[PDB]
Amino acid sequence: AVEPVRINARTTDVFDIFNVKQYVGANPYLNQAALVFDFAFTESYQPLPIENYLAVVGDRYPRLKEIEYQSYAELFASTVAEVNKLEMDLHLKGWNVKPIEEINRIAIESLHHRTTKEVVYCVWDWFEFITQGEEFDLSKQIAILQQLFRNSVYGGPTVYALLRTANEKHIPAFYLWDEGLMQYGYGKQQVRGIATTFDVDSHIDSDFTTQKDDCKKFLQELGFPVPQGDVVFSLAEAKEVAAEIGYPVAVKPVAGHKGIGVTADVQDEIELEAAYDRAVAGIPLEEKICIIVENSIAGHDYRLLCVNGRFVAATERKPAYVVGDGYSTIAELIEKENFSPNRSDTPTSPMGKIRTDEAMHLYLEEQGLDLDSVIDRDRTIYLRKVANLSSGGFSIDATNRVHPDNIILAQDIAQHFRLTCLGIDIITNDIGRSWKETSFGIIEINAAPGVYMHLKPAIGEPVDVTARILETFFETEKNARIPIITFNRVSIRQLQKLSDRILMSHPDWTIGAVCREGILINRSEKILNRHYNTNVLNLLRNPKLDLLIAEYDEDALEAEGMFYHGSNLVVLEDPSEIEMILTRDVFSDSTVIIKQGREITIKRKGLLEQYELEAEELIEQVYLKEIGTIS
Amino acid sequence: PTVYALLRTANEKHIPAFYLWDEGLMQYGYGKQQVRGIATTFDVDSHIDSDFTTQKDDCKKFLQELGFPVPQGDVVFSLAEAKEVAAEIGYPVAVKPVAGHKGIGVTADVQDEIELEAAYDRAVAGIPLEEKICIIVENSIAGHDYRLLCVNGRFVAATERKPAYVVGDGYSTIAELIEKENFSPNRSDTPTSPMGKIRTDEAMHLYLEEQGLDLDSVIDRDRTIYLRKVANLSSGGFSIDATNRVHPDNIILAQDIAQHFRLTCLGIDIITNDIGRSWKETSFGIIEINAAPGVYMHLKPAIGEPVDVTARILETFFETEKNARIPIITFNRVSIRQLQKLSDRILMSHPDWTIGAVCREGILINRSEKILNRHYNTNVLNLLRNPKLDLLIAEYDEDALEAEGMFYHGSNLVVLEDPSEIEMILTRDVFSDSTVIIKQGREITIKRKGLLEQYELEAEELIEQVYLKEIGTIS
Amino acid sequence: KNARIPIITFNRVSIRQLQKLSDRILMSHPDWTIGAVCREGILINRSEKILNRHYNTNVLNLLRNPKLDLLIAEYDEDALEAEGMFYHGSNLVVLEDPSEIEMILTRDVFSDSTVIIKQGREITIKRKGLLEQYELEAEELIEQVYLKEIGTIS
C-alpha cells in the first residue's frame, strides 16, 4: 500500500493513473511481457501545453519522430520507455498506447515488474514537478532504481549477459521457481543451470576439484608443472634426487625469513654445494634448513579459461599501486586518486575504489612499509600481494600473446574432467615463451569460474565468451523449439482423435495436449491445476515432449496472456476481436485456418483460399487433412 | 556389500574393471567407453539434481505442483475456517487434537461436512481445551512402510520394511524373551545370515514409555510386542519381498516421478495400507526420495526371492562385451621412429582418431612427445585413463613381465622378434581372430584367423615390411 | 541371434485377420516368406494349405521349412494344457480377455519384447520395460492397436 504516492501530496495534481497489471508472455496489446496501466485527466488544474513539457529535455534525447506527439499519453509513454533503460543500455525496447472510450491504455515492456512500476512512479512524480515547483532531482532515484535491479534474480553480470545473448539469438528462456533455475529450451531440447553451472556437469568431478591436495598429486603424477614442494626437510647434503625434482631445480631459500639461492638453474652440483655452504650463514642453524624448493617465483599471475575443451581468453591480474612524492603514504594519495574520472561507482566504470582493509595493513606491517612514509621520488609502491578485484585490483587482457605450448598444456589439462567451464591459474615469467625453458607453475583449477573479468577488462579489448557457451549446446534457431498447435475452442474427444491420427505416422513420439477441462499425455489422463498457466509450464518442463497442443480462449488471453511464442499452426472458428491477436505471432512457414459461419478460409504461406462450407460438415475434416504436414 | 556384487557381475559379463588410486574410484572400460564410479554413484549423474534431492521441504512443493499425493496440513484456531480449508486440502482428512490428545480422536472423516461437524464437536469437547486451539486438519496416513527402486527410469523391485517383534509365554519378562530370540540359529552373526541381532538404546525406551510395561511383568501370549517405530535393518528389523503385488497405477506413478531427474538410480519411500490397490482410492503418501540408495536389501531378503538389480545397472551402459574395449597392439622390442611411422601410416585412413604409443624411450600421443614417468606400468594406466583414446600401442620386454606383469587383458595383434623363453607367454592371451607374427633368424611365421603360414626372408629386408600389410585388420 | 527368427504369439485369432496382418507386413518386405497357423487353417503368405489333425505337428512342419522368415502362432487353453508349447521365447505377445492359465504366455519374453493385454475396454501395453494404460471407446477393435506396433519386428 503506497500511501505517499505523490509523496509531496500537493492537491494541484493534474494527472492520474490506475489499474496496473502484469502480463507475462504475449498479450492483446503487445508481443512480449509488459505492464499495463490507464491514463486520466484530473480536472480543475488544467495542464500547461505540450511545448514546455517537451522543452525540458536536457537529460535524455527522445527525438526524431517526436513530432508525432498527439497528446500527453504519447509523451508519457516515450519518457517512461526511455527511462526504462536505467542508464545501462538494456535490450528492453517497446511501448504501446491504445485510446479506448475516454481513456488511454499504456503498455510498457518489462523484465522485472517491480522496477518498472518504480520507474513509472518516479517519472510520474517528475512530470508533476514540471509545472508548479519547476525543479526535481532524479539522479538519486535513478541510482536507487539501478541498485534495485542489481539485487534481483534477473540481476547479475553473468546472468544478464547470458540473457542478452539468448535474446540476440532468439532463444527462449524463462525462470523456474521452486527449483530456482533458468531454462533455455522447450521439451527434449532443454538446458537448465544457474550462473555458469549446468545440468550436464558431473557430481564427482566438482567434488574432486575442491580436494586441493589430492588434485595436486593427481596433476603431478601426469608430469605437469606444479609446485612440487617436497616439504622443507634437509639431510645436510641431501641434494641428488631430492634436488633432482626438475630442470633448473633452483631451491629458493626462505628458512628463517628472507634469503638468496634461486641460482641452481645451472644444474652444477658443486654450485648447489657452494650455495648450501656459503649461504647457510644467512639463516643460522636455529632453523633446520627448512628450505623450499623451486617455488616458481615469477610474480605475474594469470588466469586461463577453457570451454568445451578449447581455450578461450586470458587475463593478467595486477593489484593497486601508488605513485608520487613523500607527502605521506596512507590516506592523501589514495584519497586523491580515488577522486578520478575512471574510478566511479557507475556500472560503466572500469573498476571500483581502493577500499583499504585490515589484511592490507597486515601486509604493510609484514614488510615494514610504514603508514606515513617519505618516498619523495617517482617511486611506485604496491600495496597488496593478492589482486582482489573488489578492492581496487584490476585486470589486463593477455589473450593475443600466448605461446602455443601453453595452449596445448591447458587443453590437455582441460580434457580430463566432465565439466563445461574450467579455470586454471598460473604463475609465469613470460607468457610468450615455452614453459619448458621458463619457470612455470600451476596453483589451482576451478569448476565454477567467474567470466565477468573477461567481458569488460580495464585495459584491452572485450571477448565474447557467452556466445561460445551458448554455441556449445545450440547451433541454430531450429535446435531450440518443438512443434506447437494452437486452438480457439476444442473438447477432449477431438484432442484424442487428433493425437491418435498424429501417432499413426510416428509411433514413438510423446504428445502433450492442454485444454479447459483436461490435460492429456498421448492418450492417458492426468490431473489438472486450478492455475491455467502452470499446466503449460509443467508440460514445457517435461524432458520427453515432442509436440504441444494448446487451447487458448479469450478469458486466459485477457487474464495473463500466452506462455510460448511460436504457434506453427493456428485453427480459429468464430473468433472475437481479441482472439484475432493469435494471427500475428506466426513464422514464415505457418498455416492459419479460419472459419466464419459457413465460410472457410485457408491462409497457407503459398496462396490465400476461400470456400463455402456445407450442411452437417465439421472443421474436423477441415484440419484432419492439413495435419499431414507438421514435420 | 555393493562393490563386490558389481565386481562379480562384471566378472560374469567379461567387463574390465580396476581401481584408481589418487582418486578413490573404480573404472569399467578402457578408452572412450569408460565409466567411473563408487558404489551406486556414477560420473553421468548431475550435480544440481543431486543437491536438490537433499533439500527437503522444497521437493514437497515441486511434487505438489504436479498433482501427486504428498502429506500436507493446516493450522486453525476457529471453527468454520477449518471446514473451509479442509475442502481445498483434499477431503479425506483427519482432524486430530493438539496436545490434550486424551486418547487421540483422529476422527477419520470420509466425504461429509456433517461428518466434519461431528468430528470437530467431539474434538473440542472430549479433548481438553486448556491447550492451544491448533486443530491441525491433516491427511490420513497408514503404516506398512515400502521402498521402491527405479533404474534408468524403469520400475525394478520393491520391498516392505518390518520392525522387530517379540511374544510372551506367561512366566517370562521381556529381556529373557529377547535373549531366547537371540539364541535362535537364524539370528547368528556369520556375514552370510538373513537377520541380525537385537540391541538396546533409548528409542525402545521411549517406545515402551508410549505404551506397554517397561521391562517388567509378563505378556501371557495374548499378542506380540513391538520395539521401534522404524525398522532399523542394522539391528532387529527385516525386509519382505513385494515385487509381484504392485498395482500398475503405482508403477506408472513411480515412472512419472523418476523421469524428471538426471540420475541413474532413485529410491522412493512410501506409506500405504494396501499396495495392491490404486492410489486414487486409498491412503497413499510420498515421504522421501534418495539419489544414492543401497541395493543390498533387494538382493538378500529375509523371506522371498532375490532380484538381480546389478545386471540391470550394468546393462544400462554396456550392451555386450565388445562395447567396452579398444584396439591394442603389443610389441616386445621397438623404437620411437618405428612408432612414429606406424602412427602416421594408421592416421591416413582415420584422420580424426587419437592414438597412444608407449615404449622404453618415450610416450607419444598423436605426433607429440610428453614426459615419461619413472614407474613402468603407470604410463599404461595414464593412457587407459584418457577419455579420448582410440588405439593403444605398448611394449613389454622380459624385465617388465618379470617385475609386475601386464596391465590389460587380451590383444589384437602380437609382434615378436627373436623372443626368449619368457616372452613367448605373450602369445597365450589372444582372441580367436587375432594375428600373430614371429621372426627367428630369417624365418617368418604368421598365424592369421587360425591358419598358419611360414616362409623365409632374404637379406636387406626389415620386419617393418611384414606388419605394415596386416594393419588393415584392426580397422 | 544368428539362430532365431521373429515369432508372434496370439491366444485367439481368426483366419481373416491373419491375411490382413500378413498383407500389412509384406508392404515393407516384399520378398519375405511368412507362416501363420491357427485353429481354422494354415497360411503361407496368402495361400491356404492342408491342416493336420494333431495340432503340434503343424508348428513343427512350419519350423522345418528352409525359407521361413517370420512365424505367427496362437495357443489357447486346451493346446497349452494338452502338450505345451513347442518353441522358446517370443517377440510380441497379444492377449484379449485372457484366463488364468493363458497368462503364463507372458513369462517367456526377452528384454525388448512387447506385451499387449485387453480386458473389457481397458488396454495395457508394456514396451521396452515401460508401462502404459488407457481405455478404448465404444465401437473399437484390437486390430487397430497392434497394427501400429509392428516396427520392432523389422
C110 vs B: CB within 8 A: no
Strand B17-20 versus strand A519-521 pairing type? unpaired
d(CA A326, CA B249): 84
Residues B246 and B159: beta-carbon distance below 8 Å: no
d(CA A243, CA A158): 46
Residues A239 and A433: beta-carbon distance below 8 Å: no
Contacts of A271 (CB under 8 A, 6+ apart): A263, A264
Report the residue of chain B nearest C129, measured CA to CA: B154
Mutation choice for B interface testing from A177, A190, A202, A541 by most B CBs within 10 A = A202
C135 vs B: CB within 8 A: no
| Rg, C-alpha atoms of chain A | 33
Strand B363-365 versus strand B355-358 pairing type? antiparallel
Residue positions forming the annotated binding site of A for Mg(2+): 444
Q: Which three cell numbers stand for residue A135?
A: 525543479
d(CA B242, CA B293): 18
d(CA A572, CA A488): 5
Q: At what angle do helices A113-128 and A139-150 cross, to 10 degrees?
A: 170
d(CA A343, CA B147): 61
A299 vs B: CB within 8 A: no
Beta-carbon separation of B252 and C132 below 8 A: yes
Residue corresponding to grid cell 505492464? A35
Beta-carbon separation of C149 and A507 below 8 A: yes
d(CA B305, CA B299): 8
d(CA C107, CA B331): 51
Interface of B with C in 225-254 (CB under 8 A): 248-249, 251-252
Coil, strand or helix: which one is A619? helix
Report the residue of chain A nearest C127, measured CA to CA: A508
Distance from CA of A501 to the nearest CA of B (A): 24
Mutation choice for C interface testing from B152, B252, B320 by most C CBs within 10 A = B252
Report the residue of chain B nearest C130, measured CA to CA: B154
Q: Which residues of A57-67 are buried (b: 16+ CB within 10 A; e: fewer)?
A: eeeeeeeeeee
Which neighbouring-strand residues pair with B155? B150
Residue positions forming the annotated binding site of A: 444
Task: Give the nearest partner residue to C148 out of A507, A522, A524, using CB atoms.
Answer: A507
Distance from CA of C12 to the nearest CA of B (A): 25
C138 vs A: CB within 8 A: no
A510 vs C: CB within 8 A: no
A210 vs C: CB within 8 A: no
Task: Give the nearest partner residue to C151 out of A503, A504, A507, using CB atoms.
Answer: A507
Coil, strand or helix: which one is A14? coil
Residues C49 and C15: beta-carbon distance below 8 Å: no
A529 vs B: CB within 8 A: yes
Task: Give the nearest partner residue to A218 out of B23, B50, B388, using CB atoms.
Answer: B23
Residue positions forming the annotated binding site of B: 288
Q: Which residues of B148-180 are buried (b: 16+ CB within 10 A; e: fewer)?
A: bbbbbbbbbbbbbbbbbebebeeeeebeebbee
d(CA B389, CA B192): 42
Residues of C in contact with B258 (CB under 8 A): none
Closest CA to A252 of A243, A35, A553: A243
Closest CA to C93 of C115, C64, C112, C110: C115
Coil, strand or helix: which one is A501? helix
Could you tell me where the beta strands, DSSP code E, fall in chain C?
7-10, 34-37, 42-44, 47-48, 70-74, 92-96, 114-119, 122-127, 130-135
Beta-carbon separation of C133 and A524 below 8 A: yes
Task: Give the nearest partner residue to B43 out of A204, A526, A534, using CB atoms.
Answer: A204
Which neighbouring-strand residues pair with B415? B437
H helix or E strand, kind and range, residue A548:
strand A547-551
**Which residue type does A294 have?**
E
A504 vs C: CB within 8 A: yes
Contacts of B23 (CB under 8 A, 6+ apart): A208, A214, A218
d(CA A398, CA A313): 8
C148 vs A: CB within 8 A: yes
d(CA B261, CA B254): 12
Beta-carbon separation of A197 and B370 below 8 A: no
Residues of B in contact with C1 (CB under 8 A): none
C154 vs A: CB within 8 A: no
Touching chains, C (3+ CB pairs < 8 A): A, B
**Which residue type does A459 have?**
I
Distance from CA of A122 to the nearest CA of C (A): 57
Q: Which residues of C116-150 are buried (b: 16+ CB within 10 A; e: fewer)?
A: bbbeeeebebbbebebbbeebeeeeebeebbeeeb
DSSP-assigned states of every residue in B45-73: SBHHHHHHHT-TTTHHHHHHHSS------
Contacts of A306 (CB under 8 A, 6+ apart): A312, A410, A411, A413, A414, A421, A422, A423, A424
Residues of B in contact with C131 (CB under 8 A): 155, 248, 251-252, 255
d(CA A164, CA A156): 12
**Which residue type does B253 have?**
L
B14 vs A: CB within 8 A: no
Residues B427 and B414: beta-carbon distance below 8 Å: yes
Side by side, which strands form the sheet with A18-23?
A18-23, A34-38, A103-109, A95-100
Report the residue of chain B nearest A413, measured CA to CA: B386
Task: Give the nearest partner residue to A524 out of C132, C148, C151, using CB atoms.
Answer: C132
Residues C12 and C5: beta-carbon distance below 8 Å: no
C139 vs A: CB within 8 A: no
d(CA A394, CA A458): 6
Residue corresponding to grid cell 598460473? A426
**Which residue type does A519 have?**
I
d(CA A604, CA A629): 12
How distant, in Å, are the alpha carbons of A415, A461, C13, C78, C95 from that of C83? 62, 85, 20, 9, 20
Q: Which residue blocks in A368-432 are alpha helix, DSSP H?
A: 404-414
B369 vs A: CB within 8 A: no
H helix or E strand, kind and range, residue A165:
helix A157-168
Distance from CA of A505 to the nearest CA of C (A): 9
d(CA A199, CA A214): 25
* Exposure on the CB side of residue C39, measured as CA atoms within 13 A: 11
C129 vs A: CB within 8 A: no
DSSP-assigned states of every residue in B181-247: HHTSSSS--SSS-SS------SHHHHHHHHSS-SS-S---SSSEEE--SS--TTSS-EEEE-TTS--
d(CA A469, CA A198): 11
Beta-carbon separation of C133 and B248 below 8 A: yes
d(CA B349, CA B336): 21
d(CA C124, CA A304): 56
What is the CA C22 to chain-centroid distance, rounded? 11
C120 vs A: CB within 8 A: no
Mutation choice for A interface testing from B48, B88, B371 by most A CBs within 10 A = B48
HEC string of A173-204?
CEEECCCCEEECCECCECCEEECCEECCCEHH
Task: Give the nearest partner residue to A524 out of C134, C148, C149, using CB atoms.
Answer: C134
Strand B435-440 versus strand B413-417 pairing type? parallel
Residues of C in contact with A504 (CB under 8 A): 148
Distance from CA of C44 to the nearest CA of B (A): 36
d(CA B334, CA B394): 9
What is the CA B473 to chain-centroid distance, rounded? 38
Residues of C in contact with B248 (CB under 8 A): 124, 131, 133
Q: Which residues of A584-598 are buried (b: 16+ CB within 10 A; e: fewer)?
A: ebbeeebbbbbbeee
d(CA B187, CA B210): 27
What is the CA A568 to chain-centroid distance, rounded? 29
Distance from CA of C134 to the nearest CA of A (A): 6
Burial class (CB in 10 A: 0-12, 13-18, 19+), B83: middle
Residues B54 and B262: beta-carbon distance below 8 Å: no
Task: Give the nearest partner residue to C129 out of B154, B248, B252, using CB atoms.
Answer: B154
Mutation choice for B interface testing from C2, C116, C131 by most B CBs within 10 A = C131
Q: At what angle do helices A72-83 and A113-128 cross, to 10 degrees?
A: 130
Beta-carbon separation of B248 and C129 below 8 A: no
Strand A310-318 versus strand A301-307 pairing type? antiparallel
**Phi and psi of A264, rounded to 5°?**
-95, 15
DSSP state of B303: B
Residues A191 and A118: beta-carbon distance below 8 Å: no
d(CA A593, CA A575): 11
Distance from CA of A106 to the nearest CA of C (A): 49
